[PDB]
Amino acid sequence: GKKVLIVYAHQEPKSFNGSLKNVAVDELSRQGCTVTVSDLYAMNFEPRATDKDITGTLSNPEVFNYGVETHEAYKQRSLASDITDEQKKVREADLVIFQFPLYWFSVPAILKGWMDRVLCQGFAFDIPGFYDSGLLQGKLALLSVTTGGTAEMYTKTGVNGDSRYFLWPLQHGTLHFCGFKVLAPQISFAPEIASEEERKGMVAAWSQRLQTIWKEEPIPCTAHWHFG
Amino acid sequence: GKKVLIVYAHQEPKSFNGSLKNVAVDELSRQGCTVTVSDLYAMNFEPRATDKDITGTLSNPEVFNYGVETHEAYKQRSLASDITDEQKKVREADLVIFQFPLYWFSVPAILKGWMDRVLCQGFAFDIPGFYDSGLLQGKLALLSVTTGGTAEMYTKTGVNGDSRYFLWPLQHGTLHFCGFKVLAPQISFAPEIASEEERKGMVAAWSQRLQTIWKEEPIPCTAHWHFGQ
Ligand SMILES: Cc1cc2nc3c(=O)[nH]c(=O)nc-3n(C[C@H](O)[C@H](O)[C@H](O)COP(=O)(O)OP(=O)(O)OC[C@H]3O[C@@H](n4cnc5c(N)ncnc54)[C@H](O)[C@@H]3O)c2cc1C
Ligand SMILES: Cc1cc2nc3c(=O)[nH]c(=O)nc-3n(C[C@H](O)[C@H](O)[C@H](O)COP(=O)(O)OP(=O)(O)OC[C@H]3O[C@@H](n4cnc5c(N)ncnc54)[C@H](O)[C@@H]3O)c2cc1C
Ligand SMILES: Oc1ccc(/C=C/c2cc(O)cc(O)c2)cc1
Ligand SMILES: Oc1ccc(/C=C/c2cc(O)cc(O)c2)cc1
Ligand SMILES: [Zn+2]
Ligand SMILES: [Zn+2]
């Protein structure tokens, strides 16, 4: 039995992202997996890290420290319920797939806010549980990313650089740091520019990949992997 | 006479970010610069890229494409007024400083959304008209970043990898894309770890640098600079 969380960040059901999201749901559902989707925009998911993320009265309301207050709210069970709902889905999941359009060589702010607010100290990492020992060790994470720019652009000497370069903050700084093993990213280059046939072929490739997802080994999430 | 915009992202005025923001204001105001701060959290700045960002008839209301719809909105002067307001600030600034704590090797979501929403096509870039031909050419940008991780952690052979690696999406993918010339980042490592006196040093060092900021030249915002040979 396997349990997947899809964290989906696109405003339009009929987008290329929406299609990627839906074939993941359909294939993983067809395999018999437990599937849950956090459709961030439909949820009006709050992106801002603020003192409203802590219910009750703050531990030190004089000088508001987000990292400390959230750490302490997580331990005292006083986080906002939007955050705790997300944490229960992550806790239960064996795999977390992130389905998003690349925005400024990173994730859309709404998704960034999910990272920022859900992955708090005590839940996702602690001292000493980070990187290989992060608190989510034993889970898999996969970034399924679409781009505006072409694969040629995204090379070591193309105008955008190697697509691995932009993956570092997300795969290493974020997912590795919380102890996920990182599956290889799914990158779907320039759908707006591809033909009907090319776009179908990209959806197809992803569907196929999912059939064997559970067989996969994680990448070595290293500076060498991203930059070497 | 120079005009600066500081885009500032921290919830707490008494924070180390707040002190950096305020020494910047102080010093730049002392020089006689014109200074504007966007205090994002204070402003309840909207981070989410949504259809609320266009006021008029969408080009294709059946299938919402944020990039397309905002570009056209920019050209029709139909963007949400919060976006327009930031754009005017940017347009008038000679220098844009981003003041923020590192969150997940990047900017805090609220600031990410300022990037996502403010830097739309037509305003910050066209196709063609990007990177060196981006539309914000002849402006300067500077990232002033604070971190939890120590400088050592942020080396090439340490757990976080080199500081420069995490700058890439911000310096190259965003700022250089839009035409900015990028000034060398100010990175204030691990204040929470530093002593009071070490913290003071870091604040004073930023103030000292600002004294001669208009004499600086930008970095070469290339793969090489960020990643080595
Ligand atoms: C703020 C912002 C910043 C950006 N920054 C970057 C950046 O740093 N780098 C970069 O490279 N790009 C950037 N982009 C562009 C962005 O990454 C792309 O626009 C996005 O990845 C495209 O995916 P989408 O799902 O919206 O495409 P869609 O526009 O939704 O897809 C293209 C076409 O595919 C069709 N389609 C949908 N489903 C299917 C299917 N099953 N079969 C066939 N066709 C299908 C759609 O109907 C549409 O015609 C940025 C965009 C924004 C808005
Ligand atoms: C969601 C999240 C994700 C994070 N991700 C990362 C990450 O990827 N990488 C990473 O390295 N870190 C990360 N961090 C850590 C974060 O970057 C640091 O906590 C932040 O940079 C510290 O800056 P601050 O202004 O909040 O410091 P503060 O906590 O406000 O400052 C530290 C101390 O300086 C004192 N001080 C304030 N003003 C002065 C002054 N003028 N003179 C002397 N002392 C002064 C304050 O009183 C305080 O005691 C993350 C934090 C969060 C919440
Ligand atoms: O609420 C909180 C959420 C996240 C953090 C993250 C810290 C962090 C520190 C590093 O040195 C490297 C890193 O990749 C991440 C701290 C508080
Ligand atoms: O509203 C917007 C619409 C599109 C974009 C695109 C950005 C982009 C940025 C890059 O560094 C490389 C690239 O190939 C594309 C930005 C804002
Ligand atoms: Zn890693
Ligand atoms: Zn560059």
Coordinates of C-alpha atoms and ligand atoms in Angstrom, one line a residue:
Chain A
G1 CA 0.0 0.0 0.0
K2 CA 1.3 3.4 -1.0
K3 CA 0.1 6.9 -0.3
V4 CA 0.7 9.9 -2.4
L5 CA 0.2 13.6 -1.8
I6 CA 0.1 15.8 -4.9
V7 CA 0.7 19.6 -4.2
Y8 CA -0.6 21.3 -7.2
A9 CA 0.0 25.0 -8.0
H10 CA -1.8 26.2 -11.1
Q11 CA -4.9 28.5 -11.5
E12 CA -6.5 26.7 -14.5
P13 CA -8.0 23.2 -14.4
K14 CA -7.4 22.9 -18.2
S15 CA -3.8 23.8 -18.2
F16 CA -0.9 21.6 -19.1
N17 CA -0.1 21.4 -15.3
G18 CA -3.8 20.4 -14.7
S19 CA -3.4 17.6 -17.2
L20 CA -0.2 16.4 -15.6
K21 CA -1.9 16.6 -12.3
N22 CA -4.9 14.6 -13.6
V23 CA -2.9 11.8 -15.2
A24 CA -1.0 11.4 -12.0
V25 CA -4.2 11.1 -10.0
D26 CA -5.7 8.7 -12.6
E27 CA -2.6 6.4 -12.9
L28 CA -1.8 6.3 -9.2
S29 CA -5.5 5.8 -8.4
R30 CA -5.5 2.9 -11.1
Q31 CA -2.6 1.3 -9.3
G32 CA -4.5 1.2 -6.1
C33 CA -2.5 4.0 -4.3
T34 CA -4.1 6.3 -1.7
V35 CA -4.2 9.7 -3.4
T36 CA -4.7 13.2 -2.0
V37 CA -4.3 16.5 -3.8
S38 CA -3.7 19.9 -2.3
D39 CA -4.9 22.3 -5.0
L40 CA -3.4 25.4 -3.6
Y41 CA -5.1 28.1 -5.6
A42 CA -8.6 26.5 -5.2
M43 CA -7.9 26.3 -1.5
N44 CA -7.0 30.1 -1.4
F45 CA -3.8 28.7 0.4
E46 CA -2.4 31.5 2.5
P47 CA 1.4 32.0 1.4
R48 CA 2.4 34.6 4.1
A49 CA 4.5 33.6 7.1
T50 CA 2.6 35.6 9.8
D51 CA 1.7 35.5 13.5
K52 CA -1.7 34.2 12.6
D53 CA 0.0 30.9 12.0
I54 CA 0.0 30.4 15.7
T55 CA -3.3 30.1 17.5
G56 CA -3.9 31.3 21.0
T57 CA -1.6 33.9 22.4
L58 CA 2.0 34.1 21.1
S59 CA 4.8 32.9 23.4
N60 CA 6.6 36.3 23.0
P61 CA 4.2 38.8 21.5
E62 CA 6.7 41.7 22.1
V63 CA 9.1 40.7 19.4
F64 CA 7.7 38.2 16.8
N65 CA 10.0 35.5 15.7
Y66 CA 8.4 33.3 13.1
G67 CA 10.7 30.3 13.2
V68 CA 10.7 30.1 17.0
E69 CA 7.0 30.7 17.4
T70 CA 6.0 28.1 14.8
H71 CA 8.5 25.5 16.4
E72 CA 6.9 26.1 19.7
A73 CA 3.4 26.0 18.4
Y74 CA 4.1 22.7 16.6
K75 CA 5.4 21.1 19.9
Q76 CA 2.4 22.7 21.8
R77 CA -0.1 21.8 19.1
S78 CA -1.1 25.5 18.5
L79 CA -0.5 25.9 14.7
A80 CA -3.2 27.1 12.5
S81 CA -5.4 24.4 11.2
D82 CA -4.5 25.1 7.5
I83 CA -0.9 24.2 8.3
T84 CA -1.8 21.2 10.4
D85 CA -4.1 19.8 7.7
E86 CA -1.2 19.9 5.3
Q87 CA 1.1 18.3 7.8
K88 CA -1.3 15.4 8.3
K89 CA -1.3 14.8 4.5
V90 CA 2.5 14.9 4.4
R91 CA 2.8 12.7 7.5
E92 CA 0.6 10.1 5.9
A93 CA 2.2 10.3 2.4
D94 CA 5.0 7.9 1.1
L95 CA 5.5 10.2 -1.8
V96 CA 4.9 13.9 -2.3
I97 CA 4.8 15.1 -5.9
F98 CA 4.9 18.9 -6.6
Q99 CA 3.2 19.9 -9.9
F100 CA 3.9 23.4 -10.9
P101 CA 4.9 25.9 -13.6
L102 CA 8.4 27.3 -13.1
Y103 CA 8.0 30.9 -11.9
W104 CA 11.3 32.9 -11.8
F105 CA 13.5 29.8 -11.8
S106 CA 11.5 28.6 -8.7
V107 CA 8.0 27.7 -7.5
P108 CA 4.9 30.0 -7.7
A109 CA 4.6 32.1 -4.5
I110 CA 1.5 30.1 -3.3
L111 CA 3.7 26.9 -3.4
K112 CA 6.6 28.7 -1.9
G113 CA 4.3 29.6 1.0
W114 CA 3.3 26.0 1.4
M115 CA 7.0 25.2 1.8
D116 CA 7.5 28.1 4.1
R117 CA 4.6 27.4 6.4
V118 CA 4.1 23.7 6.3
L119 CA 7.7 22.5 6.6
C120 CA 8.3 24.0 10.2
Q121 CA 10.9 23.0 12.7
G122 CA 9.7 20.1 14.8
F123 CA 7.7 18.7 11.9
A124 CA 10.0 18.6 9.0
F125 CA 13.4 18.9 10.6
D126 CA 15.1 19.6 13.8
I127 CA 18.6 19.9 15.2
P128 CA 19.9 17.2 14.6
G129 CA 17.4 15.8 12.1
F130 CA 18.2 17.4 8.8
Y131 CA 19.5 16.5 5.4
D132 CA 19.9 12.7 5.4
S133 CA 18.4 12.7 8.9
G134 CA 15.5 15.1 8.2
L135 CA 12.3 14.4 10.1
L136 CA 10.5 13.3 6.8
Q137 CA 13.2 10.6 6.1
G138 CA 11.7 7.5 4.5
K139 CA 9.4 9.7 2.2
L140 CA 10.0 10.4 -1.5
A141 CA 9.6 13.8 -3.1
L142 CA 9.4 14.5 -6.9
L143 CA 9.2 17.9 -8.6
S144 CA 7.1 17.9 -11.8
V145 CA 7.9 21.2 -13.4
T146 CA 6.9 22.9 -16.6
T147 CA 8.8 25.7 -18.3
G148 CA 8.4 28.6 -20.6
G149 CA 11.9 28.1 -21.9
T150 CA 13.3 25.3 -24.0
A151 CA 15.6 22.4 -23.1
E152 CA 18.4 24.0 -25.2
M153 CA 18.0 27.3 -23.1
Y154 CA 18.3 25.1 -20.1
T155 CA 21.9 23.9 -20.7
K156 CA 25.2 24.5 -19.0
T157 CA 26.0 27.2 -21.7
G158 CA 22.5 28.1 -22.9
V159 CA 21.0 31.5 -21.8
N160 CA 19.2 29.9 -18.8
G161 CA 21.9 27.6 -17.6
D162 CA 21.5 23.8 -16.7
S163 CA 18.0 23.0 -15.3
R164 CA 19.8 21.3 -12.5
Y165 CA 21.0 24.7 -11.3
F166 CA 17.5 26.0 -10.5
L167 CA 16.6 22.7 -8.9
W168 CA 19.1 23.2 -6.0
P169 CA 17.2 25.5 -3.7
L170 CA 14.1 23.2 -4.0
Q171 CA 15.7 19.7 -4.1
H172 CA 18.6 20.3 -1.7
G173 CA 17.8 23.4 0.4
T174 CA 14.2 22.3 0.9
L175 CA 13.4 18.7 0.2
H176 CA 16.7 17.0 1.2
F177 CA 17.0 19.3 4.1
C178 CA 13.7 17.9 5.5
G179 CA 15.0 14.3 4.8
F180 CA 13.0 13.4 1.7
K181 CA 14.8 11.2 -0.8
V182 CA 14.5 13.1 -4.1
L183 CA 13.3 11.2 -7.1
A184 CA 14.5 12.5 -10.4
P185 CA 12.6 15.7 -11.5
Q186 CA 10.0 15.5 -14.2
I187 CA 10.6 18.5 -16.4
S188 CA 8.2 19.2 -19.2
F189 CA 9.8 21.9 -21.3
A190 CA 7.9 24.6 -23.2
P191 CA 4.4 23.1 -23.7
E192 CA 3.0 26.5 -24.8
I193 CA 5.5 26.2 -27.7
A194 CA 5.1 22.5 -28.5
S195 CA 2.5 21.1 -31.0
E196 CA -0.7 19.2 -29.9
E197 CA 1.4 16.0 -30.6
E198 CA 4.4 17.1 -28.6
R199 CA 2.3 18.0 -25.6
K200 CA 0.4 14.6 -25.7
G201 CA 3.8 13.0 -25.9
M202 CA 5.0 14.8 -22.7
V203 CA 1.8 13.8 -20.8
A204 CA 2.3 10.3 -22.1
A205 CA 6.0 10.1 -20.8
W206 CA 4.8 11.2 -17.3
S207 CA 2.0 8.6 -17.2
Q208 CA 4.5 5.9 -18.2
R209 CA 6.9 7.0 -15.6
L210 CA 4.3 6.7 -12.9
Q211 CA 3.6 3.1 -13.8
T212 CA 7.1 2.3 -12.4
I213 CA 7.5 5.1 -9.9
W214 CA 7.8 2.7 -7.0
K215 CA 10.8 0.9 -8.5
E216 CA 12.8 4.1 -8.7
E217 CA 16.0 4.9 -6.8
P218 CA 16.4 8.5 -5.6
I219 CA 19.0 10.8 -7.1
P220 CA 22.2 11.5 -5.1
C221 CA 21.1 15.0 -4.0
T222 CA 24.5 16.6 -4.1
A223 CA 26.2 19.7 -5.2
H224 CA 28.0 17.3 -7.5
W225 CA 24.7 16.1 -9.0
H226 CA 23.5 19.7 -9.6
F227 CA 26.7 21.5 -10.6
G228 CA 29.5 18.9 -11.3
Chain B
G1 CA 20.2 62.7 -7.2
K2 CA 19.7 58.9 -6.8
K3 CA 16.4 57.2 -6.0
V4 CA 16.3 53.8 -4.1
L5 CA 13.5 51.3 -3.5
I6 CA 14.0 48.8 -0.7
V7 CA 11.7 45.8 -1.0
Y8 CA 11.6 44.5 2.6
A9 CA 10.3 41.2 3.8
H10 CA 10.3 40.6 7.6
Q11 CA 7.4 40.5 10.1
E12 CA 9.2 42.2 13.0
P13 CA 10.6 45.7 13.1
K14 CA 13.0 44.9 15.9
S15 CA 14.5 42.0 13.9
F16 CA 18.0 41.9 12.4
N17 CA 16.4 42.4 8.9
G18 CA 14.6 45.4 10.3
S19 CA 17.9 46.9 11.5
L20 CA 19.5 46.3 8.1
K21 CA 16.5 47.9 6.4
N22 CA 16.6 50.9 8.8
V23 CA 20.5 51.5 8.6
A24 CA 20.0 51.5 4.8
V25 CA 17.3 54.1 5.1
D26 CA 19.3 56.1 7.5
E27 CA 22.5 56.1 5.4
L28 CA 20.9 56.6 2.1
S29 CA 18.7 59.4 3.5
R30 CA 21.9 60.9 5.0
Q31 CA 23.5 60.9 1.5
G32 CA 20.5 62.8 0.2
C33 CA 19.1 60.0 -1.8
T34 CA 15.4 59.7 -2.3
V35 CA 14.2 56.5 -0.5
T36 CA 11.1 54.3 -0.6
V37 CA 10.5 51.1 1.3
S38 CA 7.9 48.5 0.4
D39 CA 7.3 46.8 3.8
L40 CA 5.5 43.8 2.4
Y41 CA 4.2 42.2 5.5
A42 CA 2.9 45.7 6.8
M43 CA 1.2 46.1 3.5
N44 CA -0.5 42.7 3.6
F45 CA 1.0 42.3 0.2
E46 CA -0.8 39.8 -1.9
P47 CA 1.6 37.0 -3.0
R48 CA -0.8 34.8 -5.1
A49 CA -0.8 35.0 -8.9
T50 CA -4.5 35.0 -9.7
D51 CA -7.1 36.3 -12.0
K52 CA -7.9 39.1 -9.5
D53 CA -4.8 40.8 -10.9
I54 CA -6.5 41.9 -14.1
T55 CA -9.5 44.2 -13.8
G56 CA -11.0 44.0 -17.3
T57 CA -12.1 41.6 -20.1
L58 CA -9.7 38.7 -20.3
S59 CA -8.3 37.8 -23.6
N60 CA -9.4 34.2 -23.1
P61 CA -11.7 33.8 -20.2
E62 CA -12.3 30.1 -20.9
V63 CA -8.7 29.1 -20.1
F64 CA -6.9 31.4 -17.7
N65 CA -3.3 31.9 -18.6
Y66 CA -1.7 34.2 -16.0
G67 CA 1.3 35.2 -18.1
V68 CA -0.8 36.1 -21.2
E69 CA -3.6 37.9 -19.2
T70 CA -1.2 40.0 -17.2
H71 CA 1.0 41.0 -20.2
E72 CA -2.2 42.2 -21.9
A73 CA -3.4 43.9 -18.7
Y74 CA -0.1 45.8 -18.4
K75 CA -0.5 47.0 -22.0
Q76 CA -4.1 48.1 -21.4
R77 CA -3.3 49.6 -18.0
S78 CA -5.8 47.2 -16.4
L79 CA -3.5 45.5 -13.8
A80 CA -4.6 45.5 -10.1
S81 CA -3.5 48.8 -8.6
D82 CA -1.2 47.1 -6.0
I83 CA 0.9 45.9 -8.9
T84 CA 1.0 49.2 -10.7
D85 CA 2.0 50.9 -7.4
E86 CA 5.1 48.7 -7.1
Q87 CA 5.9 49.1 -10.7
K88 CA 6.0 52.9 -10.4
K89 CA 8.4 52.5 -7.5
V90 CA 10.6 50.2 -9.5
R91 CA 10.4 52.4 -12.6
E92 CA 11.7 55.5 -10.7
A93 CA 14.4 53.7 -8.7
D94 CA 18.0 53.8 -9.8
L95 CA 18.7 51.0 -7.3
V96 CA 16.4 48.2 -5.9
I97 CA 17.6 46.5 -2.7
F98 CA 15.8 43.4 -1.5
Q99 CA 16.1 42.9 2.3
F100 CA 15.0 39.5 3.5
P101 CA 15.8 36.4 5.6
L102 CA 16.6 33.3 3.4
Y103 CA 13.6 30.9 3.5
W104 CA 14.4 27.6 1.8
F105 CA 17.4 28.9 -0.2
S106 CA 15.2 31.6 -1.6
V107 CA 13.0 34.6 -0.8
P108 CA 10.1 34.4 1.7
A109 CA 6.8 33.6 -0.2
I110 CA 5.5 37.2 0.3
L111 CA 8.5 38.5 -1.6
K112 CA 8.4 35.7 -4.2
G113 CA 4.9 36.9 -4.9
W114 CA 6.1 40.5 -5.3
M115 CA 8.5 39.1 -7.9
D116 CA 5.8 36.9 -9.6
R117 CA 3.2 39.7 -9.9
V118 CA 5.2 42.8 -10.3
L119 CA 7.7 41.8 -12.8
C120 CA 5.3 41.1 -15.6
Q121 CA 6.0 41.0 -19.4
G122 CA 5.8 44.4 -21.0
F123 CA 7.0 46.0 -17.8
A124 CA 10.2 44.2 -16.8
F125 CA 10.8 42.3 -20.1
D126 CA 9.5 41.5 -23.6
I127 CA 10.1 38.7 -25.9
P128 CA 12.3 39.7 -27.3
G129 CA 13.8 42.1 -24.7
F130 CA 15.3 40.1 -21.9
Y131 CA 18.5 39.4 -20.1
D132 CA 20.8 42.2 -21.3
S133 CA 17.9 43.6 -23.3
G134 CA 15.4 43.4 -20.5
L135 CA 13.4 46.5 -20.0
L136 CA 14.9 47.4 -16.6
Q137 CA 18.3 47.9 -18.1
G138 CA 20.4 50.7 -16.5
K139 CA 18.9 49.9 -13.1
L140 CA 20.8 48.3 -10.3
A141 CA 19.7 45.5 -8.0
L142 CA 21.1 44.2 -4.8
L143 CA 20.1 41.2 -2.6
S144 CA 20.7 41.8 1.1
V145 CA 20.1 38.4 2.7
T146 CA 20.3 37.0 6.2
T147 CA 20.7 33.3 6.9
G148 CA 20.3 30.7 9.6
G149 CA 23.3 28.8 8.2
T150 CA 26.9 29.9 8.9
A151 CA 29.3 31.1 6.2
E152 CA 31.1 27.8 6.5
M153 CA 28.0 25.8 5.9
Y154 CA 27.6 27.9 2.9
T155 CA 30.8 26.9 1.2
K156 CA 31.4 24.7 -1.7
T157 CA 32.5 21.9 0.5
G158 CA 30.1 22.5 3.4
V159 CA 26.5 21.0 3.9
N160 CA 24.7 23.9 2.2
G161 CA 27.0 24.3 -0.7
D162 CA 28.3 27.7 -1.8
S163 CA 26.3 30.9 -1.0
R164 CA 26.4 31.7 -4.7
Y165 CA 24.5 28.7 -5.7
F166 CA 21.3 29.8 -4.1
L167 CA 21.6 33.3 -5.8
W168 CA 21.2 31.9 -9.2
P169 CA 17.4 31.9 -9.5
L170 CA 17.2 35.4 -8.0
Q171 CA 20.3 37.1 -9.7
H172 CA 20.2 35.4 -13.0
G173 CA 16.7 33.9 -13.5
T174 CA 14.8 36.9 -12.3
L175 CA 16.9 40.1 -12.0
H176 CA 19.3 39.6 -14.9
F177 CA 16.4 38.3 -17.0
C178 CA 14.6 41.7 -16.4
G179 CA 17.7 43.8 -17.5
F180 CA 19.0 44.6 -14.1
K181 CA 22.7 44.9 -13.5
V182 CA 23.4 43.1 -10.3
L183 CA 25.5 44.4 -7.5
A184 CA 27.3 42.0 -5.3
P185 CA 25.1 40.4 -2.7
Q186 CA 25.2 41.5 0.9
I187 CA 25.0 38.3 2.9
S188 CA 24.7 38.6 6.6
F189 CA 25.4 35.0 7.9
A190 CA 23.8 33.6 11.0
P191 CA 23.0 36.6 13.1
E192 CA 21.2 34.4 15.7
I193 CA 24.5 32.7 16.3
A194 CA 26.7 35.8 16.2
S195 CA 27.3 37.7 19.5
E196 CA 25.8 41.1 20.1
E197 CA 29.0 42.7 19.0
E198 CA 29.4 40.6 15.9
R199 CA 25.8 41.5 14.9
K200 CA 26.6 45.2 15.4
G201 CA 29.6 44.7 13.1
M202 CA 27.3 43.2 10.4
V203 CA 24.9 46.1 10.6
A204 CA 27.8 48.7 10.5
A205 CA 29.4 46.8 7.6
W206 CA 26.2 47.2 5.6
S207 CA 26.0 50.8 6.5
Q208 CA 29.8 51.3 5.5
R209 CA 29.2 49.7 2.2
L210 CA 26.2 51.9 1.4
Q211 CA 28.4 54.9 1.8
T212 CA 30.2 54.1 -1.4
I213 CA 27.5 52.1 -3.1
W214 CA 27.1 54.4 -6.2
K215 CA 30.9 53.8 -7.0
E216 CA 30.3 50.0 -7.3
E217 CA 30.2 48.1 -10.6
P218 CA 27.9 45.1 -11.1
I219 CA 28.9 41.4 -11.2
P220 CA 29.1 39.5 -14.4
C221 CA 25.8 37.6 -13.8
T222 CA 26.8 34.4 -15.5
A223 CA 27.0 30.7 -14.8
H224 CA 30.6 31.0 -14.3
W225 CA 30.4 33.6 -11.6
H226 CA 27.8 31.5 -9.7
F227 CA 29.3 28.0 -10.3
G228 CA 33.0 28.2 -11.1
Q229 CA 34.6 26.5 -14.1
Ligands
LIG1 C1 5.2 34.8 -13.1 C2 5.8 33.9 -14.1 C3 7.1 33.6 -14.1 C4 7.7 32.7 -15.0 N1 9.0 32.4 -14.9 C5 9.6 31.5 -15.7 C6 10.9 31.2 -15.6 O1 11.7 31.5 -14.7 N2 11.4 30.3 -16.6 C7 10.6 29.8 -17.6 O2 11.2 29.0 -18.3 N3 9.3 30.1 -17.7 C8 8.8 30.9 -16.8 N4 7.5 31.2 -16.9 C9 6.6 30.5 -17.8 C10 5.9 29.2 -17.2 O3 6.9 28.4 -16.6 C11 5.1 28.5 -18.3 O4 4.2 29.5 -18.9 C12 4.4 27.3 -17.8 O5 5.3 26.3 -17.3 C13 3.5 26.6 -18.8 O6 2.6 25.6 -18.3 P1 1.1 25.8 -18.2 O7 0.6 24.5 -17.6 O8 0.6 27.1 -17.8 O9 0.8 25.8 -19.9 P2 -0.5 25.8 -20.7 O10 -0.5 27.1 -21.2 O11 -1.6 25.6 -19.8 O12 -0.2 24.7 -21.8 C14 0.2 24.8 -23.2 C15 -1.0 24.3 -24.0 O13 -1.2 22.9 -23.7 C16 -2.6 22.6 -23.7 N5 -2.8 21.4 -23.0 C17 -3.4 21.2 -21.8 N6 -3.5 19.9 -21.5 C18 -3.0 19.2 -22.6 C19 -3.0 17.9 -22.9 N7 -3.4 16.9 -22.1 N8 -2.7 17.5 -24.2 C20 -2.3 18.5 -25.0 N9 -2.2 19.8 -24.8 C21 -2.6 20.1 -23.5 C22 -3.2 23.9 -23.2 O14 -4.6 23.9 -23.3 C23 -2.3 24.9 -23.9 O15 -2.7 25.2 -25.2 C24 6.9 32.1 -16.0 C25 5.5 32.3 -16.0 C26 4.9 33.2 -15.0 C27 3.5 33.5 -15.1
LIG2 C1 10.5 29.2 7.0 C2 12.0 29.5 7.2 C3 12.9 28.9 6.3 C4 14.2 29.1 6.4 N1 15.1 28.6 5.5 C5 16.4 28.9 5.7 C6 17.3 28.4 4.6 O1 17.0 27.8 3.6 N2 18.6 28.6 4.9 C7 19.1 29.2 6.1 O2 20.4 29.4 6.2 N3 18.3 29.7 7.0 C8 17.0 29.5 6.8 N4 16.1 30.0 7.7 C9 16.6 30.8 8.8 C10 16.5 32.3 8.6 O3 17.1 32.7 7.3 C11 17.0 33.2 9.7 O4 16.3 32.8 10.9 C12 17.0 34.7 9.5 O5 17.8 35.0 8.4 C13 17.5 35.5 10.7 O6 17.2 36.9 10.5 P1 16.2 37.7 11.4 O7 16.3 39.1 11.1 O8 15.0 37.0 11.6 O9 17.1 37.5 12.8 P2 16.7 38.0 14.3 O10 16.3 36.7 14.8 O11 15.7 39.1 14.3 O12 18.0 38.5 14.7 C14 19.0 37.8 15.4 C15 19.3 38.6 16.6 O13 19.9 39.9 16.2 C16 19.4 40.8 17.2 N5 19.5 42.1 16.6 C17 18.5 42.9 16.0 N6 18.9 44.1 15.6 C18 20.2 44.1 16.0 C19 21.2 45.2 16.0 N7 21.0 46.3 15.3 N8 22.4 44.9 16.5 C20 22.6 43.8 17.1 N9 21.8 42.7 17.2 C21 20.6 43.0 16.7 C22 18.0 40.4 17.4 O14 17.6 40.9 18.7 C23 18.2 38.9 17.5 O15 18.4 38.6 18.9 C24 14.7 29.9 7.6 C25 13.8 30.4 8.4 C26 12.4 30.2 8.2 C27 11.4 30.8 9.2
LIG3 O1 10.4 27.7 10.4 C1 11.7 27.3 10.0 C2 11.7 26.7 8.8 C3 12.9 26.4 8.1 C4 14.1 26.7 8.7 C5 15.2 26.3 7.8 C6 16.5 26.3 7.9 C7 17.5 25.9 6.9 C8 18.8 26.2 7.4 C9 19.9 25.8 6.7 O2 21.2 26.1 7.2 C10 19.8 25.2 5.4 C11 18.6 24.9 4.9 O3 18.6 24.3 3.7 C12 17.4 25.3 5.6 C13 14.1 27.3 10.0 C14 12.9 27.6 10.6
LIG4 O1 4.2 37.1 -16.0 C1 5.4 36.6 -16.4 C2 5.3 35.8 -17.6 C3 6.4 35.1 -18.0 C4 7.7 35.2 -17.3 C5 8.8 34.4 -17.8 C6 10.0 34.3 -17.4 C7 11.2 33.6 -17.8 C8 12.3 33.8 -17.0 C9 13.6 33.3 -17.3 O2 14.6 33.5 -16.5 C10 13.7 32.4 -18.4 C11 12.7 32.1 -19.2 O3 12.9 31.3 -20.2 C12 11.4 32.7 -18.9 C13 7.7 36.1 -16.2 C14 6.6 36.7 -15.8
ZN5 ZN 20.7 17.4 -1.5
ZN6 ZN 22.8 36.5 -15.1

